[PDB]
Amino acid sequence: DSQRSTLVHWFRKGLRLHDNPALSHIFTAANAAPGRYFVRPIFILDPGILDWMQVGANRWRFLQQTLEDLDNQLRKLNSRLFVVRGKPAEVFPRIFKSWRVEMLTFETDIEPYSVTRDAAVQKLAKAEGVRVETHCSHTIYNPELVIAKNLGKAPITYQKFLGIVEQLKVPKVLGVPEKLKNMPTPPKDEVEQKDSAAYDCPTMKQLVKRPEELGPNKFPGGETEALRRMEESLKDEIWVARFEKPNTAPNSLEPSTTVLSPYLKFGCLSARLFNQKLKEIIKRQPKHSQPPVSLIGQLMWREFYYTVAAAEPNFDRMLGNVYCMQIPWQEHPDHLEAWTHGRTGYPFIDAIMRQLRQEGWIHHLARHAVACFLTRGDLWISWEEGQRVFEQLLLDQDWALNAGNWMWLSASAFFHQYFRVYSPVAFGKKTDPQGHYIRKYVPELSKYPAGCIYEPWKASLVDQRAYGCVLGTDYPHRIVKHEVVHKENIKRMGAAYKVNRE
Ligand SMILES: Cc1cc2nc3c(=O)[nH]c(=O)nc-3n(C[C@H](O)[C@H](O)[C@H](O)COP(=O)(O)OP(=O)(O)OC[C@H]3O[C@@H](n4cnc5c(N)ncnc54)[C@H](O)[C@@H]3O)c2cc1C
Numbered sequence: 001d002s003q004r005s006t007l008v009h010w011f012r013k014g015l016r017l018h019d020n021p022a023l024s025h026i027f028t029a030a031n032a033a034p035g036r037y038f039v040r041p042i043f044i045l046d047p048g049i050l051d052w053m054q055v056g057a058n059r060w061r062f063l064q065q066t067l068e069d070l071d072n073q074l075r076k077l078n079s080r081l082f083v084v085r086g087k088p089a090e091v092f093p094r095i096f097k098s099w100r101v102e103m104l105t106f107e108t109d110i111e112p113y114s115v116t117r118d119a120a121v122q123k124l125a126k127a128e129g130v131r132v133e134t135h136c137s138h139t140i141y142n143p144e145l146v147i148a149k150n151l152g153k154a155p156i157t158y159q160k161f162l163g164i165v166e167q168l169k170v171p172k173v174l175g176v177p178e179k180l181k182n183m184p185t186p187p188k189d190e191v192e193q194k195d196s197a198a199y200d201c202p203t204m205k206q207l208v209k210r211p212e213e214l215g216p217n218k219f220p221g222g223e224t225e226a227l228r229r230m231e232e233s234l235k236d237e238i239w240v241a242r243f244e245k246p247n248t249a250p251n252s253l254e255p256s257t258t259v260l261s262p263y264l265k266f267g268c269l270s271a272r273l274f275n276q277k278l279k280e281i282i283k284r285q286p287k288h289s290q291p292p293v294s295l296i297g298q299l300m301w302r303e304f305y306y307t308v309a310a311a312e313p314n315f316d317r318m319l320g321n322v323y324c325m326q327i328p329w330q331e332h333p334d335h336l337e338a339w340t341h342g343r344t345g346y347p348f349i350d351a352i353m354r355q356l357r358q359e360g361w362i363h364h365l366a367r368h369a370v371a372c373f374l375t376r377g378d379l380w381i382s383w384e385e386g387q388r389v390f391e392q393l394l395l396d397q398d399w400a401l402n403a404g405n406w407m408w409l410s411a412s413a414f415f416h417q418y419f420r421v422y423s424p425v426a427f428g429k430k431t432d433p434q435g436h437y438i439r440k441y442v443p444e445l446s447k448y449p450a451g452c453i454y455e456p457w458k459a460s461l462v463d464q465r466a467y468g469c470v471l472g473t474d475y476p477h478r479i480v481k482h483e484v485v486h487k488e489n490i491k492r493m494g495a496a497y498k499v500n501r502e
Pocket of ligand 1: 245257258259260261262264265298299301302303305362363364365367368371390394396397398399401402403405406409
């Protein structure tokens with residue numbers, strides 16, 4: 001009857017209860033002063049973007065599942081999730097007054113949109129007397145401290161980055177907040193009085209406006225599934241200890257790596273928790289792998305890309321990007337849409353592009369293959385176009401990680417040995433000589449013998465008819481001949497590399 005002010009936590013990333021310092025500070029404070037505070041954990045959902053085509057339906061569904069899981073977990077603590085519809089610029093001045101907000105917390109984000117939006121709300125909060133407290137728990141280290149320790153610039157090599165963060169101190173990992181005590185549900189504000197369900201978690205139908213893009217629900221969203229999935233990947237301590245990234249297959253029928261990337265992108269899983277549990281396993285396993293190929297090395301790859309991205313607001317762009325080589329990519333809408341829909345005539349990369357569309361995840365080396373094909377390998381199209389397609393279809397779509405890896409693959413930054421080119425025919429044969437992966441995702445070739453399913457043009461016309469799929473009618477011809485265009489493109493990279501040094 002005497003709760004006079006509301007404490008608010010604001011989810012954007014960090015969609016978990018565990019290891020969430022911003023959220024547990026609100027819960028601790030509320031329990032330390034029983035009867036003074038109402039608590040409101042909020043997510044702000046702008047309905048204007050549900051139609052944006054850069055967010056595929058698979059990612060929308062992941063988000064719906066994550067928010068439901070989050071609301072369920074918060075109910076066990078005598079709270080709940082409040083999903084507020086609106087744009088933050090209009091929501092915060094209302095609830096600041098209406099809920100009499102005393103404190104606001106959230107996890108920090110380095111993406112340029114977030115940085116400016118957060119600065120706006122900080123300004124408004126200072127004016128309105130609201131104390132703001134932010135925490136850096138999306139990453140293991142704080143990119144500003146690593147850039148500081150490096151005398152003001154981001155390290156541009158992996159090994160150098162490791163040298164700095166070795167000097168850094170590792171944050172302590174928190175558990176879950178404790179059940180709220182002596183706290184009734186908050187009284188209804190002006191909009192809850194008009195509709196008691198106005199802040200309820202949205203249904204699938206409300207979030208997924210194009211249900212026809214949905215594929216099979218292989219990777220459910222949310223913290224509960226995140227933690228369950230981590231535990232099973234660590235149950236086999238020897239597999240964890242001897243993990244070597246380049247030796248995992250891109251084209252096995254079940255994933256050869258952890259597929260924790262979607263959960264780390266949304267914050268359903270704490271990277272700091274994952275890192276600590278991995279440290280404990282390395283400790284008691286005397287022969288283990290080392291960075292960069294080890295599992296801890298993979299998390300360090302995430303950390304590296306986040307800190308260089310923090311220093312450059314054009315990280316997702318060629319021009320204005322201080323890291324990125326200026327390379328004269330060409331435009332070809334026909335080649336681009338063929339790549340985009342997995343109709344290039346190279347069965348291996350077509351199968352990758354179709355797994356991506358249907359399922360929303362593909363293995364790291366599968367990404368290397370289709371990215372190299374689109375850019376410096378064959379089509380000579382800008383990595384920005386590949387970033388665009390990946391952004392639509394990837395569950396783990398991440399601003400820094402997508403752009404950084406595309407600049408790497410296209411030899412625009414961080415990696416410069418452009419003479420190495422992946423072969424669209426040969427690369428996958430090493431790990432799937434029978435072509436099971438191709439048969440699953442390119443089912444029109446599923447009756448081809450293994451001796452030509454990677455290169456169906458080697459089959460005669462009589463054989464093609466026997467296999468049930470003739471090139472040019474049931475499956476396209478190669479849109480380019482790899483063995484000639486890749487030689488040309490190696491020359492153009494040398495030309496562009498001269499112009500940049502000069
Ligand atoms: C063109 C291209 C685009 C990419 N875009 C993304 C993206 O949008 N989102 C994304 O999360 N990763 C991206 N990656 C990196 C990498 O391919 C994925 O992180 C990884 O395949 C996810 O599978 P996993 O969780 O099983 O990885 P694991 O091998 O199990 O590694 C564990 C975790 O380490 C991190 N990690 C692993 N490899 C990398 C890497 N190369 N760079 C950065 N972090 C890494 C991720 O958090 C990952 O979940 C991209 C790579 C390429 C070549």
